[PDB]
Symmetry: C3
Subunit: 164 residues, 3 copies
């Protein structure tokens, strides 16, 4: 929908602005602004999850991956803010978002690969790469969640290789 | 204008090459190359600024935003060169370029939504976030200029949210 | 087609960089060796596609494959420089050297023929190669000089042709 594509573009801008605003707040020792920026990233991740959920349910796999790319970017910014704050609760929140994204991206990737949409499955696998980067930043000692991305990536890329 | 579009692509290449050339010049202790790269980045910023003004005059807002993106990238490269060589005056010139780009981006961003062109208003806000990053690298203690960018960002994006 | 295969090789390059970070975190030197070999394999397949695409005169496709060859060499250099592995840092330098020779040739051909868009893409890859040369052989003043003369001489020609 034209309304949801516009909303996702604005959500991405809020994520970019939150990243720079957190850098300034960290330099100033403004922990209150750091908490407001963190809540901004959480709010964007919540809305992006909404859109990806409705899009995947209504069959729009392309809109779902656009919303998931923003969800992952918001979780990455939230993990950065958690590092700036030295706050493990914010780090746990970003890790939960990365898990939610990995499960949805995996489902969309299998759906696109089953239907033979190679480009859509490639875009999904690209987001799962960015998800693994967030997992490394948040909880790198949870080898189960990281191996799950590596297995789902390895099992699918070999299938896509056969169809080319 | 296809000619001005290709010209900006060439200016984009000169900025990217200036960035890497500055890294080598710093490694070899070649202050002669470090000075040549710095003014090369300055000449690109002025040329991108000229194209931006002419594009804005002709009513081509998309071309003006492409030129300003080059101007900001040139200012960032200048800031990286300056903070490397420890030159406060080169940092000041890069700050000045960022402040001028911010003023032009804010004008285009309102003119874009005044014509109902939400996509160009979104691109302008993208550039303003890149400008805020340059302000962080040049004068982080100029709290008024960054607060000015955040207020303009919030005011405009809230207007665009009302169109979803 | 070669377009879809290149998109797959690029995905393998992205996963290799993240898999190498986890391998270093876990201290698995055997996994680091496997990731480096997969990056080396992607670089070789990209060079194959570049040579084929150039033989048919499909310069657009050749530059897409050379872009991936440079990204593969860039990932290799990061693994080598992080581990301090001088051996892998030399193999990445050889891939960058090979890419710059092919990129410069396509950049000259495109500029002579007037394909301004393809010449710009080639010059963009040349900048990415100079970055890899910084990571692998920073003290080699000559290769970077030649990259800089080739770059500025080709830019000047394109400014006139635009």
């Amino acid at each position: 929908e034209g309304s949801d594509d516009l909303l996702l573009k604005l959500l991405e801008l809020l994520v970019e602005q939150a990243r720079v605003s957190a850098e300034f707040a960290r330099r100033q020792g403004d922990e209150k602004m750091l908490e407001e920026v963190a809540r901004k990233a959480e709010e964007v991740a919540r809305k992006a999850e909404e859109i990806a959920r409705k899009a995947r349910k209504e069959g729009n796999l392309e809109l779902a991956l656009k919303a998931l790319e923003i969800l992952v970017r918001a979780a990455h910014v939230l993990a950065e803010i958690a590092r700036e704050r030295g706050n493990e609760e914010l780090l746990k929140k970003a890790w939960k978002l990365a898990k939610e994204a990995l499960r949805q991206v995996k489902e969309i990737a299998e759906q696109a690969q089953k239907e033979g949409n190679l480009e859509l499955a490639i875009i999904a696998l690209h987001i799962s790469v960015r998800i693994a980067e967030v997992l490394l930043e948040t909880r790198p000692d949870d080898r189960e969640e990281i191996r799950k991305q590596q297995e789902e990536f390895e099992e699918l890329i070999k299938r896509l290789e056969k169809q080319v």
